[PDB]
C-alpha cells in the first residue's frame, strides 16, 4: 500500500 | 529560532543539489533536535554518507538509515527509539517532513519528504518540518524511484548540516 515503515515494509 | 538544515544529495556520484529544511522546534522540539543533531553529526553519527533507500513516485522519498542502509536500521540521538512527541502538524501536501516508524513510539532516525498530501498518515507519523528550498531536488530524487520503492540510481546524502 502507501506506508513509511522501518522493519516490516507493508503493501 | 526553528533550525534551518541542509541535505546535499547526489545520484550515482552526480550532484542533484541542496534540500533546505525548516525544523518545527516550536511544535516538536525533541523530534526537531534529533534530526538537527543527525544533520551536523555532533553526537558522533548521522546522515552524512547515508542514502534514500525507498523512493515511491507520487508519494514520498524515504531516508535516515545510516546504520544498515535498507530500512532495517538507524538510531536516534537519545537511544535506539523515542516516543511520538505529538501529531499537531499534518501531512498537508508536498514538501512535508515526517518521521518513518515501525508503529507507535518507535521513532529512530528514518524520515521521509512527501511529494503529495499524505493525509492518510495523520495521527500515525510525526510531521516535524518542511522543505524551504530544493523541492526541484526532491522531484529529482522522486524521478529515480519506482512503484516498489527500489531506486534506479544510488541516492546519497553526500553532505548535511545546519545553516542557522
A1 inside 8 A of chain B by CB: no
Resolution in A: 2.4
Chain A CB contacts of B110 below 8 Å? 4, 6
Residue identified by cell 535516515 is: B64
Q: Say how far apart CA B27 and CA B100 lie, in whole Å.
A: 18
The domains of chain B, with CATH numbers, are 1-164 (2.40.100.10)
Residue B61 forms beta bridges with which residues?
B55, B113
CA B147 to chain centre: 19
Experimental method: X-ray
3-state secondary structure of B121: helix
CA atoms within 13 A on the CB side of B8: 12
Angle made by CA atoms B120, B70, B139, in degrees to the nearest 5: 55
User: Which stretches within B17-134 are classed as H helix?
Assistant: 29-40
Amino acid at each position: 500500500x502507501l506506508l513509511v515503515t522501518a522493519x516490516v515494509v507493508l503493501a | 529560532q526553528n533550525p534551518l538544515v541542509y541535505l546535499d544529495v547526489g545520484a550515482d556520484g552526480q550532484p542533484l543539489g541542496r534540500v533546505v529544511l525548516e525544523l518545527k522546534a516550536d511544535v516538536v522540539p525533541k523530534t526537531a533536535e534529533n534530526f538537527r543533531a543527525l544533520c551536523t553529526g555532533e553526537k558522533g553519527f548521522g546522515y552524512k554518507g547515508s542514502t534514500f533507500h525507498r523512493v515511491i513516485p507520487a508519494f514520498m522519498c524515504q531516508a535516515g538509515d545510516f546504520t544498515n542502509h535498507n530500512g532495517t536500521g538507524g538510531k536516534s540521538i537519545y537511544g535506539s527509539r523515542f516516543p511520538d512527541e505529538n501529531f499537531t502538524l499534518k501531512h498537508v501536501g508536498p514538501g512535508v517532513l515526517s518521521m518513518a516508524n515501525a508503529g507507535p513510539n518507535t521513532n529512530g532516525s528514518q524520515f521521509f519528504i512527501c511529494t503529495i498530501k499524505t493525509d492518510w498518515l495523520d495521527g500515525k507519523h510525526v510531521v516535524f518540518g518542511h522543505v524551504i528550498e530544493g523541492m526541484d531536488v526532491v522531484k529529482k530524487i522522486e524521478s529515480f524511484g519506482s512503484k516498489s520503492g527500489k531506486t534506479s540510481k544510488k541516492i546519497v546524502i553526500t553532505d548535511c548540516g545546519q545553516l542557522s
